[PDB]
Amino acid sequence: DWGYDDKNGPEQWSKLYPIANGNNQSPVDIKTSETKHDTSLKPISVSYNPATAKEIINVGHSFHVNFEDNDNRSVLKGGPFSDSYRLFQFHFHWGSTNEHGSEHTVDGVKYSAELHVAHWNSAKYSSLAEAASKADGLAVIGVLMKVGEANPKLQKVLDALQAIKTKGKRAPFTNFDPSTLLPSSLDFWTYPGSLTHPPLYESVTWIICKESISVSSEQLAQFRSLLSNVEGDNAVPMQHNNRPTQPLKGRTVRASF
Ligand SMILES: Cc1ccc(CNC(=O)Nc2cc(S(N)(=O)=O)ccc2O)cc1
Numbered sequence: 001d002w003g004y005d006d007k008n009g010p011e012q013w014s015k016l017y018p019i020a021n022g023n024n025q026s027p028v029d030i031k032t033s034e035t036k037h038d039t040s041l042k043p044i045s046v047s048y049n050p051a052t053a054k055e056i057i058n059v060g061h062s063f064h065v066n067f068e069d070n071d072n073r074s075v076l077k078g079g080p081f082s083d084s085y086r087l088f089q090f091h092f093h094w095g096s097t098n099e100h101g102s103e104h105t106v107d108g109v110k111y112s113a114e115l116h117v118a119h120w121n122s123a124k125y126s127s128l129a130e131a132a133s134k135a136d137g138l139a140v141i142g143v144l145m146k147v148g149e150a151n152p153k154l155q156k157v158l159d160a161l162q163a164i165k166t167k168g169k170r171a172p173f174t175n176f177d178p179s180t181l182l183p184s185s186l187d188f189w190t191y192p193g194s195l196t197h198p199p200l201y202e203s204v205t206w207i208i209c210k211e212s213i214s215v216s217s218e219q220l221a222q223f224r225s226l227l228s229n230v231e232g233d234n235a236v237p238m239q240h241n242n243r244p245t246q247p248l249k250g251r252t253v254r255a256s257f
């Protein structure tokens with residue numbers, strides 16, 4: 001099936017997922033001279049309950065931190081939305097070296113990693129599964145991670161990785177509020193786009209923070225030292241999991257600032 005290597009990677013995805021060549025694909029390069037300031041954009045409001053943190057899982061190409069999503073204890077509001085969106089997961093993307101690793105780029109500049117905080121439209125839909133294929137179904141906050149000082153807010157996450165080293169391993173991950181990972185300013189860009197890996201549904205309203213957060217070279221190494229193989233097999237480090245930027249195809253990136 002799909003991955004990030006030469007044979008199964010982003011350039012091959014269109015063979016089973018033709019939507020890969022769609023008109024609302026993500027990530028994109030944000031050109032700041034081509035952005036349109038939108039006065040109707042409200043501030044982003046996040047209110048997450050640390051009791052909704054559930055589990056951390058090695059999914060082979062990445063790792064996920066999942067949240068209980070049965071009620072509105074943890075929600076995203078404001079920005080371009082009238083609907084309340086329910087938190088379900090966060091995860092990261094990174095690259096082979098510090099030079100690249102973000103999915104979104106800003107004026108052609110690649111960052112070292114990217115944090116995704118993902119939510120589903122619980123005002124309109126009854127489940128993640130229902131919401132996932134709907135144009136207004138998902139909302140994902142993207143935060144660009146710039147290599148520099150060690151980020152202490154990443155500590156619980158990084159400390160958890162030793163228990164989920166190989167594909168399929170999972171462990172409880174509780175009492176964590178991922179708004180602690182967000183930058184202090186929530187000034188943002190927004191555009192209509194997609195999941196950045198299969199099944200690549202054009203169901204995401206992207207909220208990309210203007211301000212980066214930090215990550216050290218050694219914290220990035222921790223991500224890359226996760227293994228994509230199952231326990232007992234030859235070790236295959238998770239070297240990278242970022243998709244190349246995709247054509248805007250006439251979409252407008254709006255700015256809240
Ligand atoms: C069958 C079924 C596929 C998908 C989804 C919704 N999606 C996710 O639960 N996660 C996800 C996030 C991204 S991303 N990197 O854009 O945040 C890319 C691909 C994904 O599958 C629900 C059900």
Ligand SMILES: [Zn+2]
Pocket residue numbers: 091092093116196
């Ligand atoms: Zn992602």
